Amino acid sequence: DHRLDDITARGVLRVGTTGDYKPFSSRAGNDFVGLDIELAADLARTLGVPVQIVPTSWPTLMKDFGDGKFDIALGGVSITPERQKQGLFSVSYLRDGKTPITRCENSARFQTLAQIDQPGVRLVVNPGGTNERFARSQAPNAQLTVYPDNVTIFDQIVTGAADLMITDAIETRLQQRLRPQLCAVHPDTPFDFAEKAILLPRDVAFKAVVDKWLQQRIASGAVQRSVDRWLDFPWGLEPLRLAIDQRLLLAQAVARAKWNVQAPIEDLGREAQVIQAAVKEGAALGLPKVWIETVFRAQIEASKTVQRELFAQWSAQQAGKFDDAPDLAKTIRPELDRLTTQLLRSMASNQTVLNDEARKADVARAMRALEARALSPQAATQALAPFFLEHHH
Numbered sequence: 361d362h363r364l365d366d367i368t369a370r371g372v373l374r375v376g377t378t379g380d381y382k383p384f385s386s387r388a389g390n391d392f393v394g395l396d397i398e399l400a401a402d403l404a405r406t407l408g409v410p411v412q413i414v415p416t417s418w419p420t421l422m423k424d425f426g427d428g429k430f431d432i433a434l435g436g437v438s439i440t441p442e443r444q445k446q447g448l449f450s451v452s453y454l455r456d457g458k459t460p461i462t463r464c465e466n467s468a469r470f471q472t473l474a475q476i477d478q479p480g481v482r483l484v485v486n487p488g489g490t491n492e493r494f495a496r497s498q499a500p501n502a503q504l505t506v507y508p509d510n511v512t513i514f515d516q517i518v519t520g521a522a523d524l525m526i527t528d529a530i531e532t533r534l535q536q537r538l539r540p541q542l543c544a545v546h547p548d549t550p551f552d553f554a555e556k557a558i559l560l561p562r563d564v565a566f567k568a569v570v571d572k573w574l575q576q577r578i579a580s581g582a583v584q585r586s587v588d589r590w591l592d593f594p595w596g597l598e599p600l601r602l603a604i605d606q607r608l609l610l611a612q613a614v615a616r617a618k619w620n621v622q623a624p625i626e627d628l629g630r631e632a633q634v635i636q637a638a639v640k641e642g643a644a645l646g647l648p649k650v651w652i653e654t655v656f657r658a659q660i661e662a663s664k665t666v667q668r669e670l671f672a673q674w675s676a677q678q679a680g681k682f683d684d685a686p687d688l689a690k691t692i693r694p695e696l697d698r699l700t701t702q703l704l705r706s707m708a709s710n711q712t713v714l715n716d717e718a719r720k721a722d723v724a725r726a727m728r729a730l731e732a733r734a735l736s737p738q739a740a741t742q743a744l745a746p747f748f749l750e751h752h753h
Contacts, residue, residue, distance in 0.1 A: 361561075361562075361563050362563070363431065363561050363563040363565075363566040364407065364563075364565070364566050364569060366431075367407060367409055367431060368407075368408070368409060370409075371409060371410070372409055372410055372411070372412045373400070373403065373404040373407055373409050373410070373411050373412070373431055373432070374412050374414050374429070374430040374431045374432075375400040375404075375411055375412065375413055375414060375430055375431065375432055375433070375434065376414045376415075376416045376421065376424060376425060376429060376430035376432070376433035376434075376435075376559075377392060377396065377397070377400075377413060377414075377415070377416065377433065377434060377435035378415070378416055378417055378418055378421070378435050378510075379392050379415060379435065380417075380418075380509075380510045380511045381394075381435055381436040381510060381531070382394060382531075382534055382538075382590075382595050383395055383530065383534055383587075383590035383591055383593060383595070384396040384434070384435045384436035384556070384590075385397055385434070385435025385436060386595065388598060388601065388725065388726050388727070388728075388729055389601055389602075389605060389727075389728075389729035389730055389731060390729040390730070390731060390733070390734075391728070391729035392413045393593075393725055393726070394435070394590055394593075395583075395586050395587060395589075395590040396434040396435045396436065397413065397435075398586060398590075399434060399453075399558075399574075399577070399583075399586075400413070400432075400434060402573075402577070403432075403558075403570065403573060403574075406573050407569070414429055414430040416429070416430070416433065418486060418487060418488055418489055418510070419487060419488055419508075421433060421437075421559075422442070422443065422446055425446065425447060425559065426446060431561065432558050432559060432560055432561075432570075433558070433559040434558045434559065436528070436531075436556060437556065437557065437558070437559055438489065438490040438528075438554045438555060438556055438557075439452065439554070439555045439556075439557050440489070440490055440493070443559060447559050447560055447561060447562060448559075448560045448561070448562055448563075448564075448567050449557040449558065449559060449560060450557045450558040450560060450567065450570050450571055450574050451557065451571045451574055451575060451578075452555035452556060452557050453556060453557065453558075453574055453577070453578055453583050454530070454555070454556040454583070454587070455553050455554075455555055456528045456529045456530050456550075456553065456554060456555075456556065457528070457529035457547055457548075457549075457550020457551070457552070457553055458490075458491075458494055458526055458527070458528065458529070458550050458551050458552045458553065458554060459526065459527075459529050459532055459544065459545055459546060459547050459550040459551060460476065460524045460525070460526050460532070460544075460545035461514075461517065461524065461525055461527065461531070461532040461535055461536065461542050461543070461544055461545065462517060462523060462524035462542065462543060462545060463517060463518070463520070463523075463541055463542060463543070464541065464542065464543040466523065466524070467543050467545060470523070470524050470545055471545060471546065473498060473499065473551060476499050476502055476524065476526070477498065477499040477500065477501050477502055478501055478502060479501055479502070479503065480503070481499075481502040481503060481523055481524075482502075482503050482505065482521070482522040482523040482524075483495055483499055483502040483503065483504050483505070483522070483523065483524060483525065483526065484504075484505045484506075484507055484513060484516055484517065484522040484524075484525050485504065485505070485506060485507070485525060485526075485527075486506075486507070486510045486513065486527075487506045487507075487508060490554050491525070491526060491527050491528075492504075492506065494526055494552070495526060498526075498551070498552075499526070505522060513525070514535050514538075514539050514542065517539075517542060518539055518541050518542065524545075526551070528554065529544070529547040529548075529550055530587070530591070532544035532545070532547050533547055533591060534591055534595070537591075538595055538596060558570060558574070593722055593725070593726070594710065594713040594719070594722055594723060594726050595726075596709060596710055596713075597706075597710055597713070597714075597723065597726040597727055598726065599702065599705075599706045599709070600703065600706035600707060600709075600710055600727065600747075601726065601727045601730070602702075603699050603702040603703040603706055604659065604703060604727070604730065604743050604744065605730040605731050605732050606699055607659060607663075607696060607699040607700070607703065608659070608662055608663065608666065608730065608732040608735075608739060608740065608743050609731060609732050609735065610663075610692060610695060610696060610699070611662070611663040611664075611666035611667055611739070612666065612670065612735070613685075613686050613692050614663065614666075614667060614688065614692055615666065615667040615670040615671065616670075616682040616684065616685045616686075617685045617686060617687070617688045617692060618667065618688070619670075619671065619674060619679070619681075619682065619685075620681050620682055620685045623688075625664050625667045625668055625671065626664055631660050634656065634660065634696075634700075635652075635653055635656045635657065635660070637697075637700075638652050638655075638656045638700055638704065639652045639653060639656075641700070641701065641704055642704045642707070642708075645704060645705065645707075645708040646708065647704065647707055647708055647711070651707075651715075651746075652704070652707075654746045655703070655707065655746045656700075658742055658743055658744075658745055658746050659703070659743055661742050661743075662732075662736075662739040662740070662742040662743035663739070665736055665738055665739035665742060666732075666735065666736050666739045669736050669738075669739070714747060720747075720748045720749075720752040721748075721752050721753050723747050723748045723752070724747075724748040724752040724753050725753070727744055727747055727748065728744065728748070730743070730744070
């Protein structure tokens, strides 16, 4: 039909993605990141429009596409017969095995399909894609379990509620990194292969445009380089980001409570105590005192920044008391301390990447998009400054 003219007229390429499939497509706060998101952005550039990322889900992908919610879809989308009934696909930009991931101590036990396809084997899968279809077809005798959340379904292999999952080789390699109790089973020599591509409208001329762009990306080596980059991306920083974000948003509560009782924003004595306590808690995780002080001074400054900006608004508006004011000592402070514990724990888990000065641009990518940035750009910047600065991107 006329997809490219449709796009140019709209002034935007709309791109559906689930954001739950690292390394292709993952939420990092308010942003989506990953190999397929960078592809989307580069296609938009080539088409001469800005990109808009439209959230979907694996169970609603095809309905949302048929409903016209986006132009194209990607984020680890495999070519399948079902999807080919409804749209076209780009050329494939990644061929990858189907292979197991299991607890390392069970590597030997699930080398083969014979070993896996048996009652008393607890195989888990994502609903409604190539993995579910492979499991039902090739391991019919195993016990299958369907789990909606792909962002946590590996939890069940780790804890021993399931024995293994057969998935894309690339997901096995990444999850083996991210979840050290797990091991990819022979990813280079898999049971079968599948192809990743971009889901497109039924418009042959648009597909020709996409394939010319995509084939250049493949043949130039850029897709491969992007695969390695995203496989080595610091995915494990998300808990740290969320703790920082959640701790900072709570400053709104702090400010309403203080406004109601005419409490000063800054209390350097309290602040010193909070920092002390964080240093002591962090030392138990092996974190150095100076890094903890830098981080926590920044989180305290960012909180004050929120409070000041809110007081300045309430001042000019002549706001009275807030009916919604939680107890500072009884409700807010316990929450702040809980979030301090998560922040420290995340710092310890991610200490390697966070103390590598050469990887600040990836740390920026992972952490930048706080919900709190909508509330106070300056406070979000201050809170994140121990980890990266704006010129890190």
